[PDB]
Amino acid sequence: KEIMKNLYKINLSKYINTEDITKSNEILAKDYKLADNVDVVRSKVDICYTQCKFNECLELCETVLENDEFNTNILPAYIGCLYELSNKNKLFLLSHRLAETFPKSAITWFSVATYYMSLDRISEAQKYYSKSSILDPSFAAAWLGFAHTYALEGEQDQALTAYSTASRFFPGMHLPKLFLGMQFMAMNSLNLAESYFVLAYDICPNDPLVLNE
Amino acid sequence: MIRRAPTTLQLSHDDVTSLIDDLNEQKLKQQLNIE
Numbered sequence: 001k002e003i004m005k006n007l008y009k010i011n012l013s014k015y016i017n018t019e020d021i022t023k024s025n026e027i028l029a030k031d032y033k034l035a036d037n038v039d040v041v042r043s044k045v046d047i048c049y050t051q052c053k054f055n056e057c058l059e060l061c062e063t064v065l066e067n068d069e070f071n072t073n074i075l076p077a078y079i080g081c082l083y084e085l086s087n088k089n090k091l092f093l094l095s096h097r098l099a100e101t102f103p104k105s106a107i108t109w110f111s112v113a114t115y116y117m118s119l120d121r122i123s124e125a126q127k128y129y130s131k132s133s134i135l136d137p138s139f140a141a142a143w144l145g146f147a148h149t150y151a152l153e154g155e156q157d158q159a160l161t162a163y164s165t166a167s168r169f170f171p172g173m174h175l176p177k178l179f180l181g182m183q184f185m186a187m188n189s190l191n192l193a194e195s196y197f198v199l200a201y202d203i204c205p206n207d208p209l210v211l212n213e
Numbered sequence: 214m215i216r217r218a219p220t221t222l223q224l225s226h227d228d229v230t231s232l233i234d235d236l237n238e239q240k241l242k243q244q245l246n247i248e
Contacts, residue, residue, distance in 0.1 A: 080214050114215065145215040152218075179217050186220065212219055 003032060010043045014050045015203055021047060038064060038071065045077045052208060057081035070098065072107055076141060079114050088118045106135035110142055117145070122153045140170050144179055151183060159183055174200040182213060 006024045014021060025043060029035040041064045048056045061078045065071075075098075082091045095111035102108050113128035126149050133142035143166030150159030163180035170176065181196035197213055204210045 076214070080216065084216060117215070141214045144217075148215055148217055175214060182217055182220060209216070209219060 003028075007039075010039065014043075014046050018047065018050070038068070038074070042073055042077075045074065049077050049080065051206075052084075054081045054084040058085060069094070070101060072105070075107055075111075079111055080141075083114050083118060086118060088115065091115050091118055104135070106132040106139050106142065109135065110139070110145065113145055113149075117148070117152075120152075122149050125149045126153070137169070140166060140173060140176065143169070144176055147179065147183075151186070156183055156186060160187075174203050178204075178209060178213065185213070 006027055009024050010021065010028070012021075021043065025040060025047075028037070028040055034040060041060060045057055045061050045064075048054075048060070057077060058081050061074060061081065064074060065078065068074075078094075079091070082094075091111070092115055095108065095115045098105075098108040098111055109128050110132040113125040113132060116122075116125040116128065125145070129142055129146040129149055132139060133146055136142065143162060147159045147162035147166060150156065150162055160180070160183060163176055163183055166176040167173075167180060177196050178200040181193045181200065184190065184193040184196065197210070201210050
């Protein structure tokens with residue numbers, strides 16, 4: 001139990017009680033030579049992702065991906081960090097390899113849509129996010145990307161229902177509500193945006209997007 | 214996850230027209246004073 005408790009404690013959510021997660025990470029690193037473990041790396045990548053440390057995300061995830069390039073737990077954070085750094089060649093290579101590796105997974109089609117978004121081709125991302133969303137109902141990234149494709153396309157009425165639908169399927173995740181509030185900003189409807197921004201900020205006290213909005 | 218591109222404020226036409234007008238009366242102020 002001395003090691004099992006820490007291993008279980010690793011996998012909970014990172015937004016709250018973050019410091020204990022780090023302390024447990026170093027606890028695992030000492031006396032158990034489990035620093036090379038993949039799941040410790042996943043925990044650190046998600047930790048860096050929470051504070052938007054995208055460069056540290058890329059370096060560590062490139063170190064872990066060289067050993068294994070198709071760990072579906074690892075990949076979503078890597079795709080997000082690639083899209084944040086806005087580099088298209090690495091995303092293109094990874095997405096095209098994953099497309100020919102796992103054709104029936106939603107992650108690869110989500111990656112193709114992200115590549116098109118890095119290329120600003122909203123029309124193809126529409127279909128290639130719809131496919132990923134259909135393939136996996138529990139893939140919140142697909143709903144947020146889908147509503148983003150509506151928003152960047154030019155029309156927002158359908159994106160409104162898309163962000164609302166994303167919020168309803170996944171209660172307790174602030175980010176779809178935050179994106180929906182930004183769409184309310186885009187439509188100049190601030191009354192609902194006040195409450196929505198407050199609810200999102202209830203669990204995200206320190207992040208650039210919430211404070212900027 | 215796909216982070217949204219943050220919204221960016223835009224320099225409207227109305228406020229810049231207001232400022233350019235204010236500058237026109239600003240220069241018009243001392244031209245009669247000089248005379």
